[PDB]
Amino acid sequence: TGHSYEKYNNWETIEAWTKQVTSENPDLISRTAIGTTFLGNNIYLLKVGKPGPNKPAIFMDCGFHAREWISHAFCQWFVREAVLTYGYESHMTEFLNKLDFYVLPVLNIDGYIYTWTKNRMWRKTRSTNAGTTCIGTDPNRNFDAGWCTTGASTDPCDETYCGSAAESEKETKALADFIRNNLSSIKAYLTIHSYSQMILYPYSYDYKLPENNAELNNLAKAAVKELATLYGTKYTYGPGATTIYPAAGGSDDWAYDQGIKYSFTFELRDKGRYGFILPESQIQATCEETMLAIKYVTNYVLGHL
Ligand SMILES: N=C(N)Nc1cccc([C@@H](CS)C(=O)O)c1
Ligand SMILES: [Zn+2]
């Protein structure tokens, strides 16, 4: 163990922190398991906010992809910032009073442990595939959004394997189940990744645009403007297919298709110099600037209820 917000923490440490951060803030945090990974790890979810009746929520997950360590770190950073500024910073104070932040620290816990124990560049889950020795399904290719129709491979040996079927992975099915069971309160979906420095919105499984395309563009545009204030970090934004690439089975598209109108995929630092191996020395600056974008989007969603 040995948790730090300016260092990448292994799963043993992250799970301990989830337990500790909750015990330390009973007034603002409630911890919950929403399923288990292929290998027996508990998929924790933290409900951040001042408890109240029938509050709306914003759902944020991190750790979809094992090697994207900066995203895991961001979920942790966010949790601390939320509790230390509550009551001192008016926006965060109003956010926690009005809505609940569902923060899922790590979805792909199994693959995360693998980047720590054997392969730093692992991406997919660690599940078994019939008829092959090849391990893993790409979790952001396993959702029911034009599933496996483009930008996904049907071969288990490929890094973008779409799974045997949609929600084949316990992790994705568990995330999907949760979102389906709380659809009523969940107003926005935020999924944290790296790298590329981008804010994306639906659709990636198709070149069609969402109904609120222009609204999402204005918002993604405003958010990137916020993030840039701190250290001049430049992000690009736009619909997935044209901004990054057509890829089916993404959770952002899926959530949008559930009715969640504000759905964004965040690609954090770098642009490629360090890529997935972003120095721990950049954790704070990265998390700081990203906080401004997330809070910007939260304030918009909130003031649009
Ligand atoms: N539906 C999508 N494919 N969305 C999507 C948008 C931006 C980045 C990605 C990456 C994140 S590593 C990825 O999952 O490969 C996916
Ligand atoms: Zn990713």
CB 107 within 8 A of CB 171: yes
Q: Which residues contact 54 (CB under 8 A, 6 or more apart)?
A: 185
Amino acid at 271: K
Instruction: List C-alpha distances in Å: 282 to 74, 79, 194, 285.
Output: 11, 18, 13, 6
Token pair 């966010």 is found at 78
Resolution attained, angstroms: 2.0
CA atoms of 69 and 278, how far apart (whole Å): 8
Altogether, the residues listed in the chain come to a count of 305
Nearest residue (CA) to ligand 1, atom 15: 140
Q: Tell me how far apart the alpha carbons of residues 172 and 167 are, in angstroms, rounded to a whole number.
A: 5
Residue 100 CA to residue 302 CA, distance in Å, equals 11
CA distance 261 to 239: 13
Q: What residue segments make up the domains of the chain, in order of their start?
A: 1-305
Surrounding ion ligand 2 within 5 Å at CB are: 65, 68, 193
CA trace torsion 294, 1, 278, 107 (10° rounding): -50
Task: Quote the DSSP letter at residue 274.
Answer: S
30 sits in which H/E element: strand 29-36
State the catalytic residue, choosing from 15, 167, 267, 289.
Answer: 267
CA 250 – ligand 1 centroid, Å = 6
Q: Is the CB of 193 under 6 A from ligand 1?
A: yes
Q: Is 269 annotated as a binding residue?
A: no
Q: How far, in Å, are 9, 71, 115, 170 from residue 76 at the CA level? A: 10, 9, 18, 23
Q: Is the peptide bond preceding residue 138 cis, with omega within 30 degrees of 0?
A: no
End-to-end CA distance of the chain: 41
Q: Are 147 and 135 in contact (CB under 8 A)?
A: no
Is 267 an active-site residue? yes
**Paired tokens of 117:** 């124990």
CATH class of 1-305: alpha beta
Distance CA 128, CA 170 (A): 12
Tokens of 305: 């209820």
- Helix or strand (DSSP H, E) at 175: helix 170-181
- Given a contact cutoff of 8 angstroms between Cβ atoms, the answer to whether 267 and 194 are in contact is yes
Handedness of CA 264, 58, 261, 106 (dihedral sign): positive
Q: Are 166 and 147 in contact (CB under 8 A)?
A: yes
Strands 100-104 and 57-61: parallel
Give yes or no for residue 138 CB within 6 A of ligand 1.
no
Q: What is the number of the ligand closest to the CA of 242?
A: 1
- For residues 181 and 204, give the distance between their C-alpha atoms in angstroms, rounded to a whole number: 24
* Residue 187 C-beta-side C-alpha neighbours within 13 Å: 18
Six-digit token pair at 278?
Answer: 């972003």
Cα(198)–Cα(268) distance, integer angstroms: 7
Our CA angle for 8, 10, 11, nearest 5°, is: 130
Strand order in the sheet with 29-36: 29-36, 42-48, 100-104, 57-61, 186-194, 262-268, 198-201, 236-239
